[PDB]
Design a protein around this ligand. Sequence first.
Ligand SMILES: *[C@@H](CC(=O)OCC)[C@H](C[C@@H]1CCNC1=O)NC(=O)[C@H](Cc1ccccc1)NC(=O)[C@H](COC(C)(C)C)NC(=O)OCc1ccccc1
Ligand SMILES: *[C@@H](CC(=O)OCC)[C@H](C[C@@H]1CCNC1=O)NC(=O)[C@H](Cc1ccccc1)NC(=O)[C@H](COC(C)(C)C)NC(=O)OCc1ccccc1
Lengths: 188, 188
Amino acid sequence: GPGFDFAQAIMKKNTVVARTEKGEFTMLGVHDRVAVIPTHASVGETIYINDVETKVLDACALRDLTDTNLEITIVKLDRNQKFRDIRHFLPRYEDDYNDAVLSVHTSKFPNMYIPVGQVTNYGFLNLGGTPTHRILMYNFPTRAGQCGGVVTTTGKVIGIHVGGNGAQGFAAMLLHSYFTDTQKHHHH
Amino acid sequence: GPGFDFAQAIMKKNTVVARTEKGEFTMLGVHDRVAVIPTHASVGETIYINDVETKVLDACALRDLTDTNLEITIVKLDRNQKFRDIRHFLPRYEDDYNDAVLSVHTSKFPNMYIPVGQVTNYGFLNLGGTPTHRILMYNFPTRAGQCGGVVTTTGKVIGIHVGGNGAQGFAAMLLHSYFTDTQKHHHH
Ligand SMILES: *[C@@H](CC(=O)OCC)[C@H](C[C@@H]1CCNC1=O)NC(=O)[C@H](Cc1ccccc1)NC(=O)[C@H](COC(C)(C)C)NC(=O)OCc1ccccc1
Ligand SMILES: *[C@@H](CC(=O)OCC)[C@H](C[C@@H]1CCNC1=O)NC(=O)[C@H](Cc1ccccc1)NC(=O)[C@H](COC(C)(C)C)NC(=O)OCc1ccccc1
């Protein structure tokens, strides 16, 4: 079956409800005070985290070397709690997957799991007129209110939900190297 | 943890989407062509089952010996497929339970699981101004669109979702004896 136990361990220790000018989103915390949220959430200088106003210390809207949208924004937050480090659960590479679960943590749905079946490395996507790269796709009618939802298989956190058309859903991939302690150049 | 595998086996083989004048509802099929749906769905002479118009051969709105609403309606349907017999998964008696899952099968959510935690045998409920008896309660903000949702623990199907107030949800109980091959008197 689907790895429900695993999806639930991730939801329990590594998600929070985030609210921007654009609405609420499931937010996956990845390692220290660093989390992700779909770029189309429009993150500013402050963000509500479980209804608490929180300073956004850094926000990086990921684009690839063709300068195309990846629909991931990595945010660094001013909070007291660290997130459990889940970088080892992240895929090294692009892949296809079986039997994924999509999980949501919003005010409307504080704890909710949807098997979306099989996940295909889909690539290009015209996401609401923004060209976007590196999308995962599943044949499940995902809805508004699920963006930022965490897509897992057992032992792997593979993406966050960002789009759908009524019959498929789309997640932006997560890769391990998005989050590695690195080198120093001007990013804004 | 919660019995997700089990909730999913019930959703797979024993649920259908039912549409009445009142909207869509998760519908638990119990044994032959016999299913349940919340009384407030207002079942008539026909019902849509996975969008197919279906004759309702019999509908019993359960009330108890105080003549109070139980919010269960047992329906007998004109369909070709039998439902897998799940009467042995039904509780004999009123009880409290741990770590239940609420599952939903609608057009909006064809396959969806929510851990609602602990389930208490709650009793009386003023359900939208209808006095109702024999209600199960869980501390989880359930929403419209979840009515008829199936509440399980591992190995037991204990109720169907019927109400909530923004902080708790309420299910009407299912008991084994609701569904036993019986004696003959005029029920309408
Ligand atoms: C999550 C964000 C939200 O709830 O509202 C915006 C504040 C939401 C989830 C999807 C909506 C419907 N199904 C979903 O799973 N995502 C979006 O709305 C996308 C834009 C976005 C806004 C904010 C944050 C992140 C992303 N847009 C789409 O998903 C878009 C939906 O457009 C309509 C026309 C279907 C409503 N989908 C899309 O453009 O896919 C293109 C496509 C592909 C293949 C065939 C036909 C069309
Ligand atoms: C499912 C039916 C539906 O979606 O709409 C009607 C066609 C729905 C699910 C609940 C709605 C909000 N939360 C839920 O989990 N159930 C209902 O709407 C109930 C009536 C019903 C209609 C059709 C079929 C089955 C049942 N009504 C309620 O749940 C009611 C909600 O009323 C408001 C005022 C909160 C909107 N709840 C209620 O009356 O509880 C009383 C209470 C108890 C303790 C403290 C305060 C109030």
